[PDB]
Amino acid sequence: AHPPEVAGQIATAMASAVHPKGEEPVFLELGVGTGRIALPLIARGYRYIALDADAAMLEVFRQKIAGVDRKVQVVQADARAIPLPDESVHGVIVVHLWHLVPDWPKVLAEAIRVLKPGGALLEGWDQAEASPEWTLQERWRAFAAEEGFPVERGLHAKRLKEVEEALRRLGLKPRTREVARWREERTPREALEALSERLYSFTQGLPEPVHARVMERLWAWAEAELGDLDRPFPVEKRFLLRVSRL
């Protein structure tokens, strides 16, 4: 959940990167999820095609855009096979997807196929600086390893680097820029909850009962080492937008 001003800044940078050459611009988002990224653009009158393979996600998304879905097309499909024509959209938005797909080279390939000449691939991602939340996540990973279930570290990053390689090679000249930087409050309770809810990919591989045991231990460790679990600490974040153009 991005603060209003930040959500606005990201949308603005995204709309600024699309040059529809006299035509009304249309964005396609791969992995729209619940529409955190989509809403700010949809709210501004932009034609939008929201794609997601998760039916439960689209259900929530349809609810959120109620009353502002006149120019929105909801699509349930795998990013691997976009049910759209070659050169049909001006911008393809990809936020936190690469590490979730089995074959990104195919997803990227599909994204490039549906983009019109002069169209732009728009990748975005959050980046947070060290804070007690980082401390808790690392502790979570340590405890998981102690249960005998060590977890993989930073697949998205490596994935983001390989896509970048491909883009340059394809001549899309990927330019990355910081489009927002802010600081929010986060309490130990909130970070622990996010962990409990298995919101992060690195927490979703362990069998349910192992995660339960790790959480029990983590909650106790936080009570012992983090003071008032309802006391806020700062978390500095920035949002990066990498634009590749045809």
Three-state DSSP state, 241: strand
3-class secondary-structure state, position 26: strand
Give, as one character, the DSSP assignment of residue 229: T
Question: Rg for the chain (alpha carbons), in Å?
Answer: 19
**One-letter amino acid for residue 142 of the chain:** A
Please report, as a single letter, which amino acid is at residue 112: I
CB 54 within 8 A of CB 27: no
Q: Domain 1-130+154-187+233-246 falls in which CATH fold?
A: Rossmann fold (3.40.50)
CA–CA separation, 57 and 61 (whole Å): 6
Query: Is the Cα dihedral 224, 229, 234, 237 positive or negative?
Result: positive
Closest CA to 41 of 59, 25, 63, 58: 25
Could you tell me the strand order of the sheet in which 175-186 lies?
A: 72-76, 47-52, 26-30, 89-95, 115-128, 233-245, 175-186
Say which experimental method was used.
Answer: X-ray
Whole-angstrom distance, CA of residue 203 vs CA of residue 114: 33
| Binding residue positions | 36, 52, 78-79
Closest CA to 191 of 171, 218, 155: 218
Q: Give the H or E element holding residue 169.
A: helix 155-170
DSSP state of 175: E
Q: Which of 47, 35, 39 is nearest to 8 (CA)?
A: 39
Q: How far apart are CA 244 and CA 246, in angstroms?
A: 7
Residues constituting the chain: 246
Please tell us whether the domain made up of 131-153+188-232 is placed in CATH 1.10.8.900. Answer: yes
SS3 147: coil
Structure tokens at 1: 């959940």
Query: Which residue in this structure is represented by tokens 């060590």?
Result: 150
DSSP letter, residue 201: G
Write the DSSP assignment of 33-80 as a string of letters.
TTSTTHHHHHTTT-EEEEEES-HHHHHHHHHHTTTS-TTEEEEE--GG
- Cross-strand bridge partners of residue 242: 123, 176
Q: Which residues are annotated as a binding site for S-adenosyl-L-methionine?
A: 36, 52, 78-79
Find out whether 80 and 59 touch, Cβ atoms under 8 Å. Answer: no
Residue with tokens 């855009």: 65
Q: Which of 163, 136, 143 is nearest to 223 (CA)?
A: 136
**What gap in Å lies between CA 94 and CA 28, rounded to an integer?**
9
**Domain coordinates in residue numbering, the chain:** 1-130+154-187+233-246, 131-153+188-232
Distance CA 161, CA 159 (A): 5
Q: How far apart are CA 107 and CA 82, in angstroms?
A: 9
User: What string of H, E and C letters represents the secondary structure of 85-131?
Assistant: CCCCEEEEEEECCHHHCCCHHHHHHHHHHHEEEEEEEEEEEEEECCC
Find, among 71, 80, 76, 170, the residue nearest to 119 by Cα.
170
One-letter amino acid for residue 193 of the chain: E
